[PDB]
Symmetry: C3
Subunit: 380 residues, 3 copies
């Protein structure tokens, strides 16, 4: 099993599109060796104005990033206090939010605004909370469409699998309602995302399932690092969003000015899926044998898998390059290979000299000539 | 792709092993359903004055006492005692006993009613650092272990007698008996104790036992449907280490439990009495099981797969083992349901119903999990 | 699958040697069923006088035993306070030290004295912090040599083999703000494969003797330390767990150091919740290990320099044939638990006398002997 013996990486695009009445779902192939190594599946949902991402659940945790847009979402946590007509908390999500969906939790999204919502979802197949297999699955409560990850295997909602009489007794409702339930009078094209007519009256007035399910890593959050001449990095870990300890997931959001770069570095204990949000960058990632397994442009809308411990560096080719990196641990640590608090920095001067065969003077240069932590401004 | 199951079956044991004092039945762990589940299932019957001789396993065990009453002991390395020995306990019908990974366990029946104990070995456990094959290690006898067939005879027999002579400081005859040398390999795991036994009834204070049968306080009770009792790490903290739990269920004729799925666990449904109709559906709306589950058979329900059941007997009862200590069910109908906790409007839009139709979906059944028979 | 249905076990010397300028790295083949079952890799580094194990990191936890020699070592924990040039803390290590190296942490060693240092490393692949595959990997900051586990994989402008050599010079120049010359050195462009991971430090080195990264990273379990078990006629045992070295709780690793007088043995026993790698340090021993079918999967001599795997729940026993048999056993759990099959705190001792009688078909008085005749706990003296 050398799933992670990756010789060549590629900036990846989705290889399937699934259009529905009120939007679109795009999938990256989970079978590609990059994703299998990473142990994740990647997808991107677009909700048109007044569209509903109908309730579904998955057998693994999801970390979702809101690339664009705002709206409402709900999660159904079995055994939680409610708020005739009772229900669980509907929260608002905002552009640049990271939303945590634990395993098996039903989740839905509504766009009550004019800007299309773009949500990019990481499904943590490798999670220990996934007790099935390494195929990503989605279970839809409703409709008559295939779930996006079916095509990658070798009525369609969960109600459609049961006898009508079972459903009649269990719900104590008429054959007509049951028919609606099982999506009988509905066709594949209506799909996972659906147009809403009168809008949806969702709002006011009024173990941790009362936990915070979402955190913003956009421009209004406190950055981990901000360099007026290079950019900003903000990470969300389980210290910021405690429910992340259950999902064992985290994320990093980054922005780079033109011709600035982030220093070579690696992830101690996590795979990274880097998804390009805006612009283009030159990335290089190297493996344990000094090989250059990736060396090229990553443009908005594409993903690059960076395996744990593989070193990576990026240089922006655009006025701004922004990305969101999904990491398969809740306390993802990076080791900086260059810069203020880097590996060389924290090595005794002399061992630095004996390690790379440099005069003492050159070793000090290697240590201190670069005064910045993670970001380095472009030059003249 | 071990869990891309397109056909479930109601499974019987495919092997029976008779011994002087009883019988052990095993279900095939290589069967695709149990491999998806990450578990193995076995059933032990102890006659009057039968001793289930001490054994251990490299994975957690959860044992349900289907019938009878008796005694059991466990040996926890480095634990204060109570001759001198560790605690011997009583078990009764409907008990769930938790045996942690590697702990030596023995059972005894001192009554006429045969003890019947069904065991779930949690191979997929993080505490199992071997492989996917169930293993049991017997301290004694000269019989093969129940699961060998799916891949002297005791651990002592594999050592030189000189090693054992020096380690125990005893003569060659004691070591010979220790090694099961002269024992006929039909005596087996469960042994008759000629005159019965000499009864005396990070934490060694842990409760190892808990009753989930009728005599206990239920979690759900409906007079014209049945009852549910579940044991989790909340009820029995030691379960926190096994990462296992269990639900005992009873259904009156024509009553049912609502469509539902388990969030975070695989389930093995074992039928205790009577018959039921079960359906389970996968992620694509396909019916992977649609048929009868009678007493003495098991049905695998994978995580996130939905299951529904309707009793065909005056009383249908089952124990469901689950591969998580805090297993959460998500109810698809009834009181505390997914549909219930969606706002009225999203329900309306989701299935395309009028508000009042949605209202009915969320309210026409006010019972939690059990649904009573009709008329 | 059945990587642990082992019907035979081998006491193995390292499988391959890799010589460098200043020492030697010996690896056991991690594709041996034995190690695949255990979920670990085993290696042995030798540092000659004034030799430097150059900085490398791994995608899995390491537990390292100092078999021989004294020296310094250092780790680099991302985002940690410093000391003094400004660096992170460098510690001394002694014979018998267990050094805990967490996943991804850069680690280096220097032999500042004459006797060759010998450090044997358990790399814990089964770990959850390992998110790659079943293959041990090591990542070197410097040099132009292959990483020592590369030879066990069977499968672009590239020269050197270190992590910097894979980046283009401009990235490095920009990244470090240094000239073309320094960058070339970094990438090891002008160094040859034969120089290796362990380098001779010409003038000698210049260093002084001084998420919780302020934690203790080292603990001695050798002859200096206070024994958990001592028997004047049998030998001694010392173990380190997360209870001694709290950081072990992150690695899920522990280690047991043993030493037996001649003809002394340790009682048959099994590990509840850990696989063991027994590495022999001194003298020879007769070991037996039995599986779940009463079979002897190993039955011969374990002598200094060879490693043996005892899978979880397999019973093991040993009788020393040398004036002194000493060993270190690595176990895949920070809180390993053993069940002794014989001696005072034994599984048999904790069963009611009567079930013992009935279990083994013994008279009461014989069951009593089985409990009582051996007054010692784990070690037993020569009869």
């Amino acid at each position: 099993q050398n799933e992670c013996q990756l010789e060549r990486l590629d900036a990846l695009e989705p290889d399937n599109r699934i259009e529905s009445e009120g939007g679109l779902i795009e999938t990256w192939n989970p079978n590609n060796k990059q994703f299998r190594c990473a142990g994740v599946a990647l997808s991107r949902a677009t909700l048109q104005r007044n569209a509903l991402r109908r309730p579904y659940y998955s057998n693994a945790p999801q970390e979702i990033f809101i690339q664009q847009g705002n709206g409402y979402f709900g999660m159904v946590f079995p055994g939680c206090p409610e708020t005739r007509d009772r229900h669980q908390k509907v929260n608002r999500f905002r552009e640049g939010d990271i939303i945590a969906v634990p395993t098996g939790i039903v989740f839905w999204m509504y766009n009550d605004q004019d800007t299309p919502v773009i949500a990019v979802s990481l499904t943590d197949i490798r999670s220990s909370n996934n007790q099935l297999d390494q195929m990503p699955r989605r279970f839809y409560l409703a409709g008559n469409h295939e779930q996006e990850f079916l095509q990658y295997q070798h009525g369609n909602n969960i109600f459609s699998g049961f006898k009508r009489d079972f459903l009649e007794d269990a719900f104590n409702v008429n054959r007509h309602i049951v028919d609606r339930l099982q999506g009988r009078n509905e066709d594949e094209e209506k799909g996972a995302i659906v147009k809403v007519k009168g809008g949806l009256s969702i709002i006011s007035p009024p173990t941790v399932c009362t936990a915070k399910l979402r955190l913003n890593i956009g421009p209004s959050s406190s950055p981990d690092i901000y360099n007026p001449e290079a950019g900003r990095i903000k990470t969300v870990t389980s210290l910021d969003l405690p429910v992340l300890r259950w999902l064992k997931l985290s994320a990093e959001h980054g922005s780079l000015h033109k011709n600035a770069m982030f220093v070579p570095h690696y992830n101690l204990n996590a795979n990274s899926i880097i998804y390009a949000l805006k612009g283009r960058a030159r990335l290089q990632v190297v493996n344990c044998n000094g090989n250059t397994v990736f060396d090229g442009e990553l443009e908005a809308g594409r993903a690059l898998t960076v395996p744990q411990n593989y070193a990576v560096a990026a240089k922006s080719l655009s006025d701004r390059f922004s990305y969101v990196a999904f990491k398969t641990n809740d306390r993802a640590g990076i080791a900086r290979l260059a810069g203020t608090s880097s590996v060389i920095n924290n090595l005794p001067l002399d061992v630095v000299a004996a390690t790379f065969n440099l005069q003492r003077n050159e070793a000090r240069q290697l240590k201190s000539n670069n005064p910045f932590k993670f970001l380095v401004p472009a030059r003249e």
